[PDB]
């Protein structure tokens, strides 16, 4: 099926050439214009909603962490809306835990350390207890070189929707005042460095399950948990005094108790008595950040300025 072949192929990394859809068209076996208009349908209708470059957050120089605030209900909403205002906050959730507000914060390089940003946030919101957790996705060598201002501009203008045209790098190249060949050259290098991952198209109850697992077992455990329906993303971090859980596993079900059952099973079969179910009871924000926009810094100055008194 064409639909099946096209849907399948645009989820694969799209080649860094001048006419990538010409190449995909050849591989699929259909005329390019027909391939193009079809892609639109798939995004117009929403089984794939977008098609874009995927950049590695830390290889861009972004420090990102999972932040948890201890806020009490009277002030939960007020604090939540403050968090959402931050351009570096991607997801924000109210969860069932002593730390009842969890958000993902990403901070651009050369503005402020992440720890400083959250300190000023917590100080402004009068939040005494907070957590700064750096997790790594369990999808189961790259060295961070600071990006030049040109590479920042490249990432800045390319990060959005990939143009569904014959020459999807052309307009970008014109804006960057360079040839397509020069742009693709730089995009290739970023891909070689892992800064650019790829260019591709991509329940009722939900919970972040957190687990304390011996690190010589987190691999196996992570894979065991990954085999279950109701389990999506898994993350790992180090253990700490402030938060002894080193394995994170996003759970979902058509009910809380259903998730509880799944967690209890895992706890049983893997002998993991140390865990907690942090159910998502509110979603304040679920956007994806734009990299290297000026709006974080401007937001940041305001936080500084508002703290002046």
Q: Which of 99, 96, 136 is nearest to 218 (CA)?
A: 136
Burial class of residue 107 in the structure, from the number of CB atoms within 10 Å of its CB (0-12 exposed, 13-18 middle, 19+ buried): buried
Q: Is 252 a catalytic residue?
A: no
Distance CA 232, CA 180 (A): 38
Distance CA 203, CA 50 (A): 21
Per-residue b or e along 222-235, where b marks 16 or more CB atoms closer than 10 Å to that residue's CB: beebeeeebbeebb
Q: What is the resolution of this structure in A?
A: 2.0
Token pair for 291: 């990299």
- Experimental approach taken: X-ray
Domains of the chain, start order: 1-61+148-202 (1.10.10.2890), 62-140+203-309 (3.30.70.3460)
Q: Phi and psi of 172, rounded to 5°?
A: -55, -45
Q: Largest Cα–Cα distance in the chain?
A: 66
Of 91, 97, 233, 252, the active-site residue reads 91
- What is the SS3 assignment for the chain? CHHHHHHHHCCCCCCCCCCHHHHHHHHHCCCHHHHHHHHHHHHHHCCCCCEEEEECCHHHCCEEEEEEECCCHHHHHHHHHHHHHCCCEEEEEEECCCCCEEEEEEECCCCCCHHHHHHHHHHHCCCCCEEEECCEECCCCCCCCCCCHHHHHHHHHHCCCCCCCCCCCHHHHHHCCCCHHHHHHHHHHHHHCCCEEEEEECCCEEEEEEECCCCCCHHHHHHHHHCCCCEEEEEECCCCCCCCCCEEEEEEECCHHHHHHHHHHHHHHCCCCCEEEEEEEEEEEECCCCCCCCHHHHHHHHHHHHHCC
Residues β-bridged to residue 68: 102, 131
Q: Do strands 275-286 and 89-95 pair parallel, antiparallel, or not at all (unpaired)?
A: antiparallel
Distance CA 97, CA 223 (A): 26
Size of the chain in residues: 309
CB-based contact 69:84 (threshold 8 Å): no
Token pair for 217: 């077992």
Distance CA 13, CA 94 (A): 35
Distance CA 181, CA 166 (A): 15
Q: Which of 94, 105, 98, 100 is nearest to 283 (CA)?
A: 94
CB-based contact 259:205 (threshold 8 Å): yes
Distance CA 213, CA 40 (A): 45
Distance CA 113, CA 213 (A): 29
């Amino acid at each position: 099926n064409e639909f099946d072949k096209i849907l399948k192929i645009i989820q694969k990394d799209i080649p860094l050439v001048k006419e990538p859809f010409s190449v995909l068209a050849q591989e699929v076996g259909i005329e390019e214009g027909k391939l193009l208009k079809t892609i639109e349908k798939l995004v117009e209708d929403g089984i794939v909603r977008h098609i874009a470059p995927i950049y590695d957050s830390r290889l861009l120089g972004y420090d990102s962490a999972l932040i948890a605030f201890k806020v009490d209900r009277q002030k939960l909403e007020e604090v939540a809306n403050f968090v959402n205002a931050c351009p570096g906050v991607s997801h924000n959730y109210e969860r069932t835990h002593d730390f009842n507000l969890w958000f993902t914060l990403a901070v651009p390089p050369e503005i402020s350390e992440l720890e400083d940003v959250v300190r000023l946030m917590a100080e402004r919101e009068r939040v005494k207890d907070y957590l700064v957790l750096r997790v790594v996705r369990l999808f189961k060598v790259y060295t961070y070189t600071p990006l030049t201002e040109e590479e920042k501009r490249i990432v800045s203008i390319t990060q959005g929707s990939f143009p569904l045209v014959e020459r999807p790098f052309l307009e970008y190249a014109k804006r960057l005042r360079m040839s397509e060949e020069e742009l693709l050259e730089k995009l290739s290098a970023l891909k070689e460095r892992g800064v650019l991952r790829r260019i591709s198209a991509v329940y009722v109850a939900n919970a972040m399950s957190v687990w304390e697992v011996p690190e010589d077992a987190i691999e196996e455990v992570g894979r065991y948990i990954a085999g279950f329906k109701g389990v999506s993303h898994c993350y790992q971090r180090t253990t700490s005094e402030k938060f002894r859980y080193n394995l994170f596993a996003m759970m979902h079900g058509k009910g809380q108790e259903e998730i509880k059952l799944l967690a209890e099973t895992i706890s049983r079969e893997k002998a993991l008595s140390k865990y907690a179910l942090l159910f998502s009871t509110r979603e304040f924000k679920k956007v994806r950040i734009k990299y290297f926009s000026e709006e974080f810094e401007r937001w940041f100055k305001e936080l500084i300025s508002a703290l002046e008194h």
